[PDB]
Amino acid sequence: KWKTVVAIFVVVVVYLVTGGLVFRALEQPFESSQKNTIALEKAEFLRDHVCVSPQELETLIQHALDADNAGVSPIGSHWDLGSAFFFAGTVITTIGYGNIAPSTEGGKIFCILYAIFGIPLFGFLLAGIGDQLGTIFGKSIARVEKVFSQTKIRVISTILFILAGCIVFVTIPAVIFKYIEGWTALESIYFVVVTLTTVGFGDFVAGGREWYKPLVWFWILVGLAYFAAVLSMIGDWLRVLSK
Amino acid sequence: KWKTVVAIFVVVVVYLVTGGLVFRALEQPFESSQKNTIALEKAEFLRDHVCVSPQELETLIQHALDADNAGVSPIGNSHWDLGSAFFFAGTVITTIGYGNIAPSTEGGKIFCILYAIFGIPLFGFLLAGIGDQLGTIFGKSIARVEKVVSQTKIRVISTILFILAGCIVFVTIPAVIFKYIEGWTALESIYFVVVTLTTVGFGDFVAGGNAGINYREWYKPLVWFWILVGLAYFAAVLSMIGDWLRVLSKK
Numbered sequence: 050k051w052k053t054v055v056a057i058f059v060v061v062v063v064y065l066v067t068g069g070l071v072f073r074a075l076e077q078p079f080e081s082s083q084k085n086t087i088a089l090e091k092a093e094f095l096r097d098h099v100c101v102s103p104q105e106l107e108t109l110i111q112h113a114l115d116a117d118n119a120g121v122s123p124i125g126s127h128w129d130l131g132s133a134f135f136f137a138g139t140v141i142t143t144i145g146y147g148n149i150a151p152s153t154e155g156g157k158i159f160c161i162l163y164a165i166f167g168i169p170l171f172g173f174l175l176a177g178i179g180d181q182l183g184t185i186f187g188k189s190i191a192r193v194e195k196v197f198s199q200t201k202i203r204v205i206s207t208i209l210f211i212l213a214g215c216i217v218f219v220t221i222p223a224v225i226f227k228y229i230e231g232w233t234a235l236e237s238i239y240f241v242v243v244t245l246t247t248v249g250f251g252d253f254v255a256g257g258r259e260w261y262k263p264l265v266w267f268w269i270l271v272g273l274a275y276f277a278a279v280l281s282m283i284g285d286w287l288r289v290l291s292k
Numbered sequence: 293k294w295k296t297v298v299a300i301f302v303v304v305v306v307y308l309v310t311g312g313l314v315f316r317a318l319e320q321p322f323e324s325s326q327k328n329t330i331a332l333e334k335a336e337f338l339r340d341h342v343c344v345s346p347q348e349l350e351t352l353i354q355h356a357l358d359a360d361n362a363g364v365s366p367i368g369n370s371h372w373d374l375g376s377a378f379f380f381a382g383t384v385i386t387t388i389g390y391g392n393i394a395p396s397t398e399g400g401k402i403f404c405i406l407y408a409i410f411g412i413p414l415f416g417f418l419l420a421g422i423g424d425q426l427g428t429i430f431g432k433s434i435a436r437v438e439k440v441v442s443q444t445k446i447r448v449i450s451t452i453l454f455i456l457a458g459c460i461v462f463v464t465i466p467a468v469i470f471k472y473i474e475g476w477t478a479l480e481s482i483y484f485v486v487v488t489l490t491t492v493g494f495g496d497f498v499a500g501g502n503a504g505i506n507y508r509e510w511y512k513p514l515v516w517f518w519i520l521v522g523l524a525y526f527a528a529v530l531s532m533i534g535d536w537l538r539v540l541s542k543k
């Protein structure tokens with residue numbers, strides 16, 4: 050119904066204005082602080098190093114930023130067979146971190162075609178594992194239904210399936226990332242959330258051991274496939290309940 | 293069937309190795325060039341400015357990089373205004389997650405986790421709602437083509453017609469606008485639109501991000517509204533093709 054589509058649109062637009070005001074309140078005091086710190090650090094450099102002009106300073110900062118935008122660290126390979134395989138998977142999963150991004154005009158042209166004829170291909174694999182996990186969930190709810198309202202059985206089992214994935218694909222990998230990457234308890238859970246939601250800001254990237262990067266993508270594939278199966282299972286029920 | 297899941301997995305793993313080798317061939321010569329450029333530029337700075345030590349140089353570069361990671365441009369003398377913060381909220385919700393604007397505060401990250409978990413499925417409803425309305429537009433248009441040959445051939449000619457319709461209204465027309473407003477190349481404009489609608493969002497190109505550009509107030513929310521209708525249309529097209537394939541799988 051169109052009366053409900055407008056109602057959801059009102060909720061979403063309210064959620065963005067509300068959410069936007071919460072983020073502003075949480076990040077603008079930090080942004081204001083960092084704006085003052087870089088201005089004071091740049092002024093301190095020119096104050097101590099008299100031989101440097103303010104324009105020659107900006108030229109170097111711009112050169113350091115241009116190198117960073119290309120993917121080269123201006124401190125002290127990102128396209129090796131392993132890293133380029135992980136970047137390909139970063140496009141396919143729609144995560145798109147941004148730490149590694151095509152800089153060549155030709156590299157962009159291929160990235161456009163690789164996403165268009167690649168993201169639906171991943172849909173098939175995610176749907177396949179989705180159909181397989183459905184068989185596991187369906188048999189488990191039928192086992193509880195053989196013992197135990199149908200809605201109460203469905204809600205209890207689903208929450209357990211959700212929490213099962215929250216330990217195996219959310220908690221356990223965040224613990225591994227806290228030890229390997231050396232991030233904080235927050236940053237590890239934050240990265241896992243930002244990765245599995247396919248948001249992928251790129252502010253935290255795993256592998257930034259040889260078996261690490263391919264095993265990280267395999268975790269993404271199973272991790273996504275599991276929650277995608279639960280979301281499919283809940284959706285299918287809602288449309289059945291709608292009829 | 294599990295026999296087909298393994299078959300798709302083989303194709304996907306082949307597609308990543310193949311694709312990865314193509315990207316390496318296209319980007320490693322450029323990466324090798326930029327690696328030499330920054331090394332020569334840093335050495336030239338210390339050569340001309342004798343009074344600067346190599347360690348004091350790295351300290352400044354790291355300070356400039358730390359400011360950039362926070363979202364503050366280390367060039368010359370806000371990203372969280374009611375306008376930009378609304379667009380960032382939408383960037384989380386749509387799962388695009390560009391990167392230019394990202395939570396740096398511990399508390400901001402905690403809220404970002406909760407805002408995505410209890411927000412991305414809410415967007416699902418909105419995209420499903422518009423997708424349920426577009427299906428009515430598609431079903432009537434397929435019936436109009438069928439009024440003018442097998443049903444599958446009609447569906448193929450109708451699907452091509454629907455994709456081409458969206459490729460002009462949500463892909464070509466907005467890329468043309470972005471080429472004039474942002475000032476990007478003909479490639480970068482189409483590339484940004486593709487990277488945006490695919491919900492990939494690298495953040496290498498972000499609409500309403502140039503400091504030296506004096507944008508209008510209606511720009512950023514209308515750009516997000518384009519994302520909504522744009523995504524909704526291609527999501528409805530994808531839901532339609534999938535539905536038919538599962539129907540064909542049974543029959």
Ligand SMILES: CCCCCCCCCCCCC
Nearest residue numbers: 142143168171172247409412
């Ligand atoms: C073929 C595209 C794959 C990426 C989309 C998966 C979305 C997962 C959303 C999880 C929901 C968590 C609240």
Ligand SMILES: CCCCCCCCCCCCC
Nearest residue numbers: 165386412415416490491526
């Ligand atoms: C609940 C938000 C879902 C966002 C992901 C949708 C992906 C759409 C891809 C369309 C196909 C383009 C080739």
Ligand SMILES: [K+]
Nearest residue numbers: 145249389493
């Ligand atoms: K992204």
Ligand SMILES: [K+]
Nearest residue numbers: 143247387491
């Ligand atoms: K995404």
Ligand SMILES: [K+]
Nearest residue numbers: 144248388492
């Ligand atoms: K993304």
